[PDB]
Amino acid sequence: ASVHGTTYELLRRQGIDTVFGNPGSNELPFLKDFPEDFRYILALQEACVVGIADGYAQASRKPAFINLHSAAGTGNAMGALSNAWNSHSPLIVTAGQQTRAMIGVEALLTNVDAANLPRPLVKWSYEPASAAEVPHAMSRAIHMASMAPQGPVYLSVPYDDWDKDADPQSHHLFDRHVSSSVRLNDQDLDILVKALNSASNPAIVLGPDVDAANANADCVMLAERLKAPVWVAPSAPRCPFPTRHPCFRGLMPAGIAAISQLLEGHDVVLVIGAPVFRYNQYDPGQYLKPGTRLISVTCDPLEAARAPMGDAIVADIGAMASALANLVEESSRQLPTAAPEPAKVDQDAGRLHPETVFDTLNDMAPENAIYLNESTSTTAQMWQRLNMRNPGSYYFCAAGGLGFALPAAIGVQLAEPERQVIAVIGDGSANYSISALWTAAQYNIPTIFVIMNNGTYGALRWFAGVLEAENVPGLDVPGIDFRALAKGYGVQALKADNLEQLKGSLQEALSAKGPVLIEVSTV
Amino acid sequence: ASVHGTTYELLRRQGIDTVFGNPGSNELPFLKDFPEDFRYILALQEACVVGIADGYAQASRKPAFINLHSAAGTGNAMGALSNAWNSHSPLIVTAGQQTRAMIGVEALLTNVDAANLPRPLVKWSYEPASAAEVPHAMSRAIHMASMAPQGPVYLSVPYDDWDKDADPQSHHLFDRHVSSSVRLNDQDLDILVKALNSASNPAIVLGPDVDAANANADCVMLAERLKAPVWVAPSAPRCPFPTRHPCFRGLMPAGIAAISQLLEGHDVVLVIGAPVFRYNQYDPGQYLKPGTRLISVTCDPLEAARAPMGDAIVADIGAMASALANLVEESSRQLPTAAPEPAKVDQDAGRLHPETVFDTLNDMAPENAIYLNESTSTTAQMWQRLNMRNPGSYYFCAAGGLGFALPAAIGVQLAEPERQVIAVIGDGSANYSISALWTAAQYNIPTIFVIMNNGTYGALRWFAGVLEAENVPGLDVPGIDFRALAKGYGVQALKADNLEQLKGSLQEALSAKGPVLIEVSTV
Amino acid sequence: ASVHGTTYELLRRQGIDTVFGNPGSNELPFLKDFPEDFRYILALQEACVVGIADGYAQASRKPAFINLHSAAGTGNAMGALSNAWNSHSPLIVTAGQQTRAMIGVEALLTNVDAANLPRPLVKWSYEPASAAEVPHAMSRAIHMASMAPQGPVYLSVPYDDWDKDADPQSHHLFDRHVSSSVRLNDQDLDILVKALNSASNPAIVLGPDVDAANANADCVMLAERLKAPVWVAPSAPRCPFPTRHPCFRGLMPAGIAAISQLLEGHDVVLVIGAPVFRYNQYDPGQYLKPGTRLISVTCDPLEAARAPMGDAIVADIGAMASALANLVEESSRQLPTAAPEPAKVDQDAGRLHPETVFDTLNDMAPENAIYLNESTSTTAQMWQRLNMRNPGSYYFCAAGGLGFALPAAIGVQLAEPERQVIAVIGDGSANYSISALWTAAQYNIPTIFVIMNNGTYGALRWFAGVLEAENVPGLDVPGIDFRALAKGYGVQALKADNLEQLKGSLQEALSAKGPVLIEVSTV
Numbered sequence A, B, C: 001a002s003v004h005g006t007t008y009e010l011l012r013r014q015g016i017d018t019v020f021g022n023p024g025s026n027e028l029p030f031l032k033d034f035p036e037d038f039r040y041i042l043a044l045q046e047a048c049v050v051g052i053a054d055g056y057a058q059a060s061r062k063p064a065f066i067n068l069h070s071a072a073g074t075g076n077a078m079g080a081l082s083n084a085w086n087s088h089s090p091l092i093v094t095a096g097q098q099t100r101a102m103i104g105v106e107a108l109l110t111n112v113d114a115a116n117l118p119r120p121l122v123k124w125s126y127e128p129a130s131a132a133e134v135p136h137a138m139s140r141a142i143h144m145a146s147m148a149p150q151g152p153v154y155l156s157v158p159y160d161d162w163d164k165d166a167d168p169q170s171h172h173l174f175d176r177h178v179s180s181s182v183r184l185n186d187q188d189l190d191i192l193v194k195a196l197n198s199a200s201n202p203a204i205v206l207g208p209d210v211d212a213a214n215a216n217a218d219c220v221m222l223a224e225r226l227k228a229p230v231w232v233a234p235s236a237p238r239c240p241f242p243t244r245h246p247c248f249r250g251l252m253p254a255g256i257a258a259i260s261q262l263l264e265g266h267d268v269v270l271v272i273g274a275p276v277f278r279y280n281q282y283d284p285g286q287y288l289k290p291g292t293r294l295i296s297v298t299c300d301p302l303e304a305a306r307a308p309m310g311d312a313i314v315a316d317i318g319a320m321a322s323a324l325a326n327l328v329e330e331s332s333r334q335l336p337t338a339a340p341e342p343a344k345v346d347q348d349a350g351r352l353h354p355e356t357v358f359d360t361l362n363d364m365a366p367e368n369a370i371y372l373n374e375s376t377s378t379t380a381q382m383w384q385r386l387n388m389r390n391p392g393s394y395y396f397c398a399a400g401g402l403g404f405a406l407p408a409a410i411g412v413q414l415a416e417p418e419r420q421v422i423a424v425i426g427d428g429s430a431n432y433s434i435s436a437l438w439t440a441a442q443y444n445i446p447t448i449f450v451i452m453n454n455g456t457y458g459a460l461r462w463f464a465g466v467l468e469a470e471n472v473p474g475l476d477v478p479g480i481d482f483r484a485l486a487k488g489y490g491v492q493a494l495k496a497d498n499l500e501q502l503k504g505s506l507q508e509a510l511s512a513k514g515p516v517l518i519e520v521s522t523v
Ligand SMILES: Cc1ncc(C[n+]2csc(CCOP(=O)(O)OP(=O)(O)O)c2C)c(N)n1
Pocket: A079, A374, A375, A376, A377, A378, A400, A401, A402, A403, A425, A426, A427, A428, A429, A430, A432, A454, A456, A457, A458, A459, A460
């Protein structure tokens, strides 16, 4: 067998059947004789390729395979990898290298010091020392991406390697099963459970690794048992809990003082599947108030190490959530009461308030819709106004890096063909990965893109307001026609200048047979 | 509180009370007002400092704290860190940096690009962005070193940071408990146990992480239950099993073909706490023979990823070994029969055969002796001739890097004051970290050093023999007087030119009140 | 031809004929069939190997070739590389890697992420992608080490590469000549010369790259022409000027305020071949006083970039010094008057004052002696008391990393067989690379080692004194018998407890036919 044949067999035997890519000459020897059981998803720029693959992996809860062109292609995707690192996304990023005979002279297309390029944003980064090592290296990449804590990995392969003879002993790679589905030992788990049972006023904080593990339902059971309020950890990349469940208390503000104030009076706070904490704004104060102790369950040693407070347990979120939910006592305390419905903001016949947009989406979208958020000044209102009952219903750029949601929404829709994906994206954010629209058109992936057009980098204008910062340049983005951009890439386009038009546009989009972009004129 | 005060409080609250170091000017502001409850262990070169700390950590099964001088001191210790990486040793390596005001100009003693210096040999490597961050950074270092898979970490601290005011919120760091004591979920564990119960001819292979976890006794129970032969994985850094237990089959040869041949006919091979496998010599063949399937339990995702065959489970070795030992059925098969005693090699009244030396050590040493091995051509015979009944009885440089055993033997003896440590070190190996002898003398750490003097790099002469390589320079090391070197550093010295003298020297050494070096004239 | 044959031909054609090494199994395929026109210099630990090679390169003013064993051997040499980086030493460091077939599984002796290991202490660091690339990679290493600014480089080679067929086109590598012997363009050089001619009170500061370039004599002419005082830049790794020349003003204190005060009243300060500046102690103040402007000539862009003041020219020191010396006018100003002889310190019949030792060395040593300094508390007095008329007469660890002088003194003596080398080394410093003594004995390299024994890390006790730092541990190093250590490694040993004995010991050492160590009892 050739290295080509052996590698594709390894991939299929490990459950991989799709290649997200933007091709180049170093990659042609890999892509030639493309297996008929594989499919290739092309995107026009590498931030888009990786974004689509990211959404696909996160929604599918399995590794996604990417093929990029050398250094330039890898480099174009680096911003996307920053998000993927923060969301623990299992991405196998492969990049083609020059033929081994031409690497020394640094011919055009040589990826110099390749393994160092994507660092520090990958778990593992490697170029094999020989062609016959390629399948083994790929095996390592697959497992490194897939083991908790999941994350992106990088493999560079000289283009001449593919046609070489493979090592017959590579067959041992094909069916390897590697598990990190582990939980705390019985003795210490019993101690934790007793601490939870004995809490007088427990609180629960959930992060994205809960949704990644599909531990949502187990966490619901856990919260019901403990009769505990449930918060989502700040800067949330995913939604780990039904947002209209009586225990739900919403998204935590990303501030030290704000969070300790919120947790005041809670004697035990159990954090599951989140960093402690992904703060953002400067908000100095106490990490925790006197009387509050914190216990964190995390799949990532790096999270456990850097928490400034509390105890920590490093284990699989799925296994831990299931164990806790089934071991804790049913508290005799009263179940928390559901949060009241959000108020309806006054809305005239003119430009749309973001609150109106979200209320309308919630009214019209299917109960199993999936939302993506890259409307950076409206996040708080979005979280308050969308009823998300099911797992996998929300994605937001995990490192705050714009250019995620547009392509990721396409990958999510590919992963979940029966769930309507609706991406809500600011006019500023929409530009970073605008060319991703073409992939939705070409493959007829019926994502709905809602562009919130207020003509400015609104979040930045706000922050600049609090800083009292004057004379800041570059905050306005006037003069973009999003319907024209959609037309450019073959996506049906609608405009909503008022509520009447928004309702009409959504009705049309929800019944369309392909992707649709709606440009919404917002305050 | 100052950063100095807060950091030392964090250290003591996290169980650290010893600093292994070689001081410099960047470190004086850290070492001043040295806490009276701490002790400082000085060594004369940094390979020695880290070697001593390594032995101490491995034997004590807890993190060891090191303080080195900037780049030059860190660099001197890099070889030692290569071993520490391979042995999963929990080492917290701190190095002093220039004052922040002088870093930009790159004053003398500035550690440039500090975090990159020790890579790729550390799990985490960092320099804090401000003085007040130092305690938090130290907390991260402690936990990163201590979490499975354990390993060395690096923290660089500008010397002006220590006197600065600490953040009062740093108190939350002091008592953090972080656990990675996890094991496979019940459902999948039941599947594994059933596979072991159903095996017709199981074999067990154990690596160093078993001894590190003190899982030895649990593995004995497991082997007795399964009535399974037990091997030690190749290139063994530690001893994970009683060497005269009936199930013990010895050290595996570090070759692909050799190991698959050894495992032939065994239907299920369970590897615990080892890489799969730390091969060494070129010995091409099948990774496993038809009929053999392999299951690996490892604490290290990097080990699980790179195994060329078998299934893998990433979990704590202590928790997994305990669970398996207590869950498996008692097989009705006959218990394996103990390996026969080694033959006595013919010995005249002249120079000592290594076999004679080991037989004599086994005859005279206490039953709870601890051995270190850096006699590279005699490893196989050592493993066959020393009865090691207890855990923590053997250490060998885990990356094959010479200069480990001499200093590590001092750290081991410090960790285990009631167990006689005997380091068996070749005349070549003895030189790499010779100055470590001084620390044994100064602190009266009563390690016995047995120098095997054959005048050559024997292992290299052998390999060169197999390669049929002619005209290889640099293989001979004549003209070293080890008694004089011992005298130089204040250690009692004896010479053994024959068996009569060896017995006499050992009698004296075993009854001495301080460290002793015995130079043995070997074939 | 084989890769082995081709590589050795490239080496000899590029002027390399010596390999400084400590061998290992990954290196045996390189060292086998060792060319009869090459010689191999063995040292017992890698800090020693690199130190010897460093001294050899610095004294010979040409690249030195080193061969180490994988990661552990490279790591052991990292401290030595920190000095080599700072001294711009042209060192070609090669390390053997595992066979390509075993790299993936990370067999014992695999150098993982090899190229990253020695960073940030090398100019270039690489592992070739194929065997046939090895000669080309070596060519790159040779030239990267040799081009201004000179420095250490690193090449990792899988052991199976050597026996493979070489590319016939590699012959084009053999005779490549690469030059960086450049100087400022005529127009701008004329501007500089006019600025020097027009200075009313110029000063000159010289660094180690002057001595490396053998530009010393040109700088003497330049100083005589300009009638300018000459200082040596702080933390001096070499001596760039005759120390009894009338213009000589000695070693600058390594402080910001001290240096600006020293330069006060000098309108133009010309720095040649030094960083601006290698300050050490905290000594805040003005970089330059009003009225002083600085112009730096440096071979290193990194030096030019980081200077906090002055203009800079990046060019070859030899070419620039020659041009300036021959272009500037002869000033009508009076030639500076020579510095007065140092005072004679009162000396009783007991322990030696360092001043006495240096005065005696100056009295008895040949006029073409070469000194090395690793007696860290006595540097100022050494610089004042040794008359060094010739180039290449002084070496001091360029990064302040101890363990340099002992081995480097052996390499220097090898480079300069007709110049008596005398290394003055503190009792603390002597231990770091003590095993280097063996190489001097084995090859009969007649270096004289003067050990200054005061029982303490004296420089550190002093600094701790100024810091007013109490309770600092680890500052004393009692109980070392250096005569015994010398005997251990086969070097003749003498002791000097007083002046009478010092004179007698020096008389014997200077007439000896081999290396000699003198242990001096100092205050
Ligand atoms: C790749 C990238 N570039 C720049 C930024 C900085 N940034 C954060 S929010 C923001 C404004 C986004 O504007 P828009 O998408 O219109 O949403 P709005 O703030 O108007 O609601 C910018 C530029 C970022 N987070 N990521």
